[PDB]
Design a protein around this nucleic acid. Structure first.
Ligand SMILES: [Zn+2]
Lengths: 61, 136, 111, 58, 155
RNA sequence: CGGUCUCCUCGACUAGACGUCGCUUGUCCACGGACGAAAUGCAGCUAAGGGAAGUCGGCAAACUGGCCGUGCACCUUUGGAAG
RNA sequence: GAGCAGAUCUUGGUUGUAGUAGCGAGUACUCCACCUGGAGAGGAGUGGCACCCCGCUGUGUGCGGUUGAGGACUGGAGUGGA
RNA sequence: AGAGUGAUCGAAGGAUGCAAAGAACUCCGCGAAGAGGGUUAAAAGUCCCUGAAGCCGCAACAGGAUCGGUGGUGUGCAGUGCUGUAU
RNA sequence: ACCUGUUGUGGUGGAUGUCUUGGCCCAGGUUCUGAGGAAGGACACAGCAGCCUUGCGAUACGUUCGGUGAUACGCAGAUCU
């Protein structure tokens, strides 16, 4: 488990799920030093954690 | 009883690549090297001079470019395999045995697929100007 | 000294349809990656072959059992670019979107 | 069927802890300890088992 | 204690290493060391590198019933050979410790050869495997003790 | 790979809580790798001409298959048979 | 309570079998990066070199975990939430 | 301890040394180990009085087709002891 | 190389020998539990304690007092001549 706690906290704080959370691969260190929901909030505010837009089930067809 | 499997009972094992002698094969033609003749596979009926190598070459072999033999039927082994040809030993006196053979036609169409044409010029004349030919 | 051991850059077309032919559908793309490795090894005479993630993406653009029939690759046999150890060449094989493989023979960069 | 596949339906509890003998022998439905017989004042003990006595003697 | 089954003429010309409860299959380590027995230290290490790289193999002479035939076993007039990876790595560590011991004793290890490499069956550690019809059978690990002596060349 | 109580339950095709695929959620974990990968096997398929000649025995597989329109026999306990 | 070769004898420890049979239901993995004592892989690989450096040579389709980029599965009577 | 829903069933398991003096320090290794070096009368090394048979590894030596066997017999040949031994 | 053997050695193994705070046996004495709460069962209680204890009960591995008379101890920590 490298970033599992951070992914879970980010899923909670973003109201999506860990499979829509994007952790910056070029900031893995600062992400791994998160340790709390407050620091995950800071990371989300800073852009190292993102809520990926829901995939498309287009209805034009 | 006998309480042993015998040599006469069919068992599984190596199939093929055995030494075999296929006897009484008639030679239907001896053609000269294609480098010197360029028309070795032409017969009484053909109007275009052609060599026994078919269209697209012999599959997995290539061009035939040496003195070739036309053995009747099938000979052992795959292509590219070395076949000793000996003078017959189990000699008969049928006409099937002592018969003169003259070849009237040699099928040189493509054996890689289904070849409708015996000659690349025949193929041209049938399928005339195409895009690649008109681009050349 | 050998040119085998010098930095190089080739652009070459691997035909992956010779590789993934008769192969098990669920394993075609894994076999194509392994074949790209073996290809680049035979060519660049290295042991460190590093496939670009975009080249992986391209090889998998059809999923398994849908591997493209050929990929234009760029084999860059590179100096180790940073070490404290010995020379240790390595080759980063990337993908070249070509849209047309016509008369596209092997090329060398800055010949 | 009998074995492996009917061992899965085997939740529930015939017996639970008795408050006299602290043994999981107190039948829940008929509130009777299967070892000491709790509801009645005498302790349950038969001469046909010396070991059972040994395990509770003073 | 510390007792090897090899008497050297001058232990001032030797290098010794021992391994206990090595948690490697014995029957593969035995064949590994039997192949490595008489080789020099350089030949030995190169042989192990090549066995790891699968370029040449380890002949399974005694403990090899069912082993697959190889073209790489012609090196030893045999046909059954394999590439025991964990045992090759463990014997690599063994010989590396023996070479370090040589260096400590003040000895060129590249001049020494392998004299008396050896393996023993250690104490077996049990596990449970679960068989049909409600049976239980053991899984015993069969580990090994290893020992090696390197003796300097005599010219 | 068995069993074990209840609740919520999206989009498209569709009669649909069938079946097939997809957003949300979750997951890539089941010991793996090479070699086109023998024989045999367990599974999926095909097969000319014939069509049960196979076999205790049409076993196994195959044929048919949804819906709409026309229409439907013997026998009947008048209900059916009947898709 | 006094002698073992047996009693499908009792208890314990073992052997061959045998590195064998196997570890084949639930479709599936791949690439880069980081985490390592090591994991793009060597035991003093080899020639100069007298360790630095410059050459040459070998490396098993390659442990584990986690981001990211792809490929797929679950497909609401779920591998989801109680 | 463990097993059984339960009534009940129910094991295996003793010994360092006089004294913990229970292994300092060194090299190598990630580390365990290992190689040294120590304690001690001795490693007797927390598996610790001794350590049998069966089985296994290794080295040396002797042989190796044949129920043409194990075993017996009478010699032989190698290796290996023992006893006696005149002037 | 493999096999068979014989030695030497090293492992696996725990037989043997020697002992024993244990049992078994015989003889003698006592039998002395409880509604003033027994026998048993729980949950607690130690600076570092899980188990065990015919240890103990919120006064909780112990309180008063007597006999003894410098320890106890696996570490520490203040009391003690
Ligand atoms: Zn009770």
């Amino acid at each position: 488990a490298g970033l599992k706690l951070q992914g879970r906290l980010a899923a909670a704080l973003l109201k999506c799920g860990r499979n829509r959370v994007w952790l910056d691969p070029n900031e893995t260190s600062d992400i791994a030093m998160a340790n709390s929901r407050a620091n995950v909030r800071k990371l989300i505010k800073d852009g190292f954690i993102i809520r990926k837009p829901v995939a498309v089930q287009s209805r034009a067809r | 009883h006998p309480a042993r499997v015998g040599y006469t009972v069919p068992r599984a094992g190596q199939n093929g690549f055995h030494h075999r002698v296929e006897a009484n094969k008639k030679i239907y033609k001896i053609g000269k090297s294609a480098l010197v003749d360029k028309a070795n596979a032409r017969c009484e009926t053909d109007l275009t001079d052609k060599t026994i190598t078919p269209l697209g070459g012999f599959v997995r072999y290539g061009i035939v470019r040496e003195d070739y033999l036309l053995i009747k039927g099938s000979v052992p082994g795959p292509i590219k395999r070395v076949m000793t040809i000996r003078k017959a030993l189990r000699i008969k006196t049928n006409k099937a045995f002592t018969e003169e053979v003259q070849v009237k036609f040699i099928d040189t169409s493509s054996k890689f697929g289904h070849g409708k044409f015996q000659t690349r010029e025949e193929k041209r004349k049938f399928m005339g100007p195409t895009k690649k030919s008109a681009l050349r | 000294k050998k040119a085998k051991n010098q930095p190089l850059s080739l652009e070459t077309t691997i035909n992956l349809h010779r590789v993934v032919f008769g192969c098990t559908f669920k394993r075609r793309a894994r076999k194509a990656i392994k074949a790209i490795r073996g290809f680049v090894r035979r060519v660049m005479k290295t042991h460190d072959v590093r496939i670009d993630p975009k080249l992986n993406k391209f090889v998998w653009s059809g999923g398994v059992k849908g591997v493209p029939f050929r990929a234009r690759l760029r084999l860059d046999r590179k100096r180790s670019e940073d070490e404290d150890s010995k020379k240790k060449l390595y080759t980063v094989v990337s993908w070249v979107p070509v849209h047309d493989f016509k008369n596209l023979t092997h090329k060398k960069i800055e010949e | 069927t009998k074995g492996t596949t009917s061992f899965g339906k085997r939740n529930g509890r015939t017996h639970k802890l008795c408050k006299r003998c602290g043994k999981r022998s107190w039948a829940v439905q008929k509130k009777r300890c299967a070892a000491c017989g709790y509801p009645n004042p005498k302790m349950r003990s038969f001469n046909w088992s010396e070991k059972a006595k040994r395990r509770n003697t003073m | 204690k510390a007792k090897y089954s090899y008497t050297p003429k001058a232990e001032a010309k030797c290098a010794k290493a021992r391994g206990t409860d090595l948690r490697v299959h014995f029957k593969n380590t035995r064949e590994t060391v039997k192949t490595l027995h008489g080789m020099t230290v350089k030949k030995a290490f190169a042989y192990l590198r090549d066995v790891l790289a699968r370029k040449r193999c380890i002949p399974f002479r005694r403990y090899g019933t069912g082993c697959g035939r190889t073209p790489q076993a012609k090196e030893f007039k045999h046909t059954r050979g394999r590439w025991p990876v964990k045992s090759v790595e463990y014997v690599q560590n063994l010989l590396k410790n023996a070479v370090a011991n040589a260096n400590t004793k003040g000895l060129d290890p590249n001049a020494m050869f392998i004299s008396h490499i050896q393996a023993n069956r250690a104490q077996q550690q049990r596990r449970r495997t679960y068989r049909a019809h409600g049976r239980i059978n053991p899984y015993m690990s069969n580990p090994c003790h290893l020992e090696v002596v390197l003796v300097t060349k005599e010219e």
